[PDB]
DNA sequence: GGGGGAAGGATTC
DNA sequence: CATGGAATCCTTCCCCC
């Protein structure tokens, strides 16, 4: 089995450039302005160019506008970067029938019974990073092994617009020094249990018993490092479909009156079901950002689906049961709706 | 004991 | 200071044969 597994490079500041090729050059931050004060919010991406001054996604356009104050600074535009993405998508399904669309992008193909070695391989990735290209503009880079694990490991080495293989020689290798915190679905919290655990590398799980790693970090989380350990990790690209589908906002300002939330929620709502299009719901969520940053929800599930109706007096009572339960103030509300007919 | 769903949350990207 | 959409997994209940 032979997995590729191509990422677009800066994608939402990338697509900005390709559309105002003008800013091609600059440093162009891509921002989620929250409507509070002046500038608040957080940088969605930003391109290479400002990157290297340390302004990425996550971070305050505050604080990015304290170190490049020149900057572009543009408001994320979702929708258009996702119909670039679809179209981008489309041109991969012309290489393999096997697709594994993970974000926005990132899509992992399995190019199995259409090449033969890995230096077939590496030629279908040149000549897909070229068919992008020209077709819409966009660099991306490839990463190319044996599995989707160590697919995608090869391309966050070789980022931005590059092409990497890792042969089942190197693979071995990695297992043996990569540093467990740089495998996907390792965030922050798990590579610190693992420290505690001594597990610094993929190799590492072996020398601990099994259960106190399942107790640690969870069955699942074990059973994927070791068989990744193992060499035996071989997950199949399936493709996903959307099993929910939701959206939250930031209020002016925090609140715990019912009155003074309902609008932002209701807004929530709308938007929620228009993403819908067509789809009915089960299942409700009222999802609510507490002021320290912490995240509670209240959900119900009806055993038919949910009408827009049912929906907005359904989200009031979750909210109120949060209220009513949680005493800190909301910084954030929004819906989330699933478990589709 | 144990299947199985629901709810609230944790963690990742 | 601190946006935001969505998947997967974990723990705790709960109904019940
Ligand atoms: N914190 C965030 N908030 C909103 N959108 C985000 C955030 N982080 C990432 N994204 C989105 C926009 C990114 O361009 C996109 C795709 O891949 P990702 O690796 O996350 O970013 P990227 O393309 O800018 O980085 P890179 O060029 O290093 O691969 O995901
Ligand atoms: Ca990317
Ligand atoms: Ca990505
Ligand atoms: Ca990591």
């Given at each position: 089995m032979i997995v590729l597994f191509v990422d677009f490079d800066y994608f939402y500041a990338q697509v900005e450039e390709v559309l105002n090729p003008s800013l091609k050059g600059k440093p162009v931050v891509v921002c989620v302005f929250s409507?509070?004060?002046?500038?608040?919010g957080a940088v969605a991406t930003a391109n290479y160019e400002a990157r290297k001054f340390?302004?990425?996604?996550?971070?305050?356009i505050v604080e990015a506008k304290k170190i490049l104050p020149n900057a572009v600074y543009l408001p994320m535009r979702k929708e258009v970067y996702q119909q670039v993405s679809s179209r981008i998508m489309n041109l991969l399904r012309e290489y393999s029938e096997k697709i594994e669309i993970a974000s926005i992008d990132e899509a992992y193909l399995d190019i199995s019974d259409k090449v033969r070695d890995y230096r077939e391989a590496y030629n279908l990735g040149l000549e897909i990073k070229n068919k992008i290209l020209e077709k819409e503009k966009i660099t991306v880079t490839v990463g190319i092994s044996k599995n989707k694990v160590f697919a995608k490991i090869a391309a966050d080495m070789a980022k931005p617009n590059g092409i990497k293989v890792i042969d089942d020689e190197e693979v071995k290798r990695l297992i043996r020094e990569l540093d467990i915190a740089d495998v996907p679905g390792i965030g922050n919290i798990t590579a610190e249990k693992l420290k505690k655990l001594?597990?610094?590398?993929?190799?590492?799980?072996?020398?601990?018993?099994f259960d106190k790693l399942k107790g640690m970090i969870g069955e699942a989380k074990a059973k994927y490092l070791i068989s990744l350990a193992r060499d035996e990790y071989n997950e199949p690209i399936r493709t996903r479909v959307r099993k929910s589908i939701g959206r939250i906002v930031t209020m002016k300002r925090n609140s715990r009156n019912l009155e003074e939330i309902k609008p932002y929620l209701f807004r929530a709502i709308e938007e929620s079901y228009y993403k819908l299009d067509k789809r009915i719901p089960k299942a409700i969520h009222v999802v609510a950002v507490t002021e320290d940053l912490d995240i509670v929800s209240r959900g119900r599930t009806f055993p038919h689906g949910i009408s827009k109706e049912t929906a907005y007096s359904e989200s009031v009572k979750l909210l109120q049961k949060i209220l009513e339960e949680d005493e800190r103030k909301i910084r954030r509300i929004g819906v989330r709706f699933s478990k589709f007919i």
């Open positions: 409507g509070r004060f002046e500038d608040s340390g302004v990425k996604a996550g971070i305050p001594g597990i610094n590398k993929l190799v590492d799980t072996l020398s601990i018993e």
